[PDB]
Amino acid sequence: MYKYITILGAAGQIAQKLTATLLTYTDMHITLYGRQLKTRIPPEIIDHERVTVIEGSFQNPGKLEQAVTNAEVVFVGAMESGSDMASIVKALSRKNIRRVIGVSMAGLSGEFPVALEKWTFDNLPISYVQGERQARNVLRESNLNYTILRLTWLYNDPEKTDYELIPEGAQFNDAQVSREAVVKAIFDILHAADETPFHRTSIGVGEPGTHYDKPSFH
């Protein structure tokens, strides 16, 4: 259980859905961090009592440190850059913050079966994959109590909330997962009384029964 969460990369879709779910179903105090949030995030997610908004980029150490000051857990919505990741890890270090949950992409460790892997890496810019790899590596090299969530291909559907967790090293066969399902997974991890399964682990999140060669048109 946590009370104070800081969400980095707060304008991202999963980050916004997470914020809404935390406001509706918990008593958590939420600090949102990012560039021009008051204009990129809707009024129904921002004007609320338990939301504190701090504007800034990952290259503003002062603003970033303010945002994570007294956080009990930090959610990193986008792990796209080694540089951004190092800045985050440093800020957490300086403020004695230990617990972090971050979102990465499935596939980096060659865990997708052949066809899904080839389709995936032909439908992503190389620079994007490279940056995700570097961010992942920086976080793994830290001493943080991290949980990396390796997400397969995302889509939106409020009626799809089912997910399964795929341990590191296991073949990851699910070609898709809804953002709503990922948010449920994050919610459930935030409510885990025993954190051991999530302690410095990298866990795949997928929609059960989507063993396809590519994500569906859904």
3-state secondary structure 28-68: CEEEEEECCHHHHCCHHHHCCCCEEEEECCCCCHHHHHHHH
Residues 28-87 interacting with Cl ion (rule: CB under 5 A): 34
**Which of 5, 6, 9, 204 is close enough to bind Cl ion by CB under 5 A?**
9
Kindly state the tokens that stand for 190. 């935030």
Residue 179 C-beta: closest distance to Cl ion, Å: 6
Instruction: Work out which of 5, 6, 7, 14 binds Cl ion, going by CB under 5 A.
Output: 14
Candidate list 12, 82, 102, 107; residue touching Cl ion; CB under 5 A: 12
The nearer residue to Cl ion, 13 or 96, going by C-beta atoms, is: 13
7-15, 16-24, 93-101, 196-204 -> range binding Cl ion (CB under 5 A): 7-15
What is the smallest separation between the CB atom of 193 and Cl ion, expressed in angstroms? 27
Question: Of 3, 13, 157, 216, which lies in the binding site for Cl ion, with binding defined by CB under 5 A?
Answer: 13
CA within 13 Å, CB half, 126: 0
- Can you give the C-alpha Rg of the chain in angstroms? 17
**Nearest residue to 54 via CA among 212, 70, 124:** 70
**Of residues 5, 7, 11, 139, which one binds Cl ion by CB under 5 A?**
11
Compute the least distance from the CB of residue 147 to Cl ion, in Å.
17
When the beta carbons of 80 and 111 are compared against Cl ion, the nearer one is 80
Torsion angle of the four alpha carbons 131, 134, 140, 143, in this order, in degrees rounded to the nearest 10? -100
Q: Which lies closer to Cl ion via its Cβ, residue 56 or residue 113?
A: 56
Catalogue the E-assigned strands of the chain.
Answer: 4-8, 29-34, 51-55, 73-76, 99-105, 145-151, 153-155, 164-166, 176-178, 201-206
- Residue nearest Cl ion (C-beta atom): 34
Count of residues in contact with Cl ion, rule CB under 5 A:
7
- Tally the residues of the chain: 218
List contacts with Cl ion (CB under 5 A).
Answer: 9-14, 34
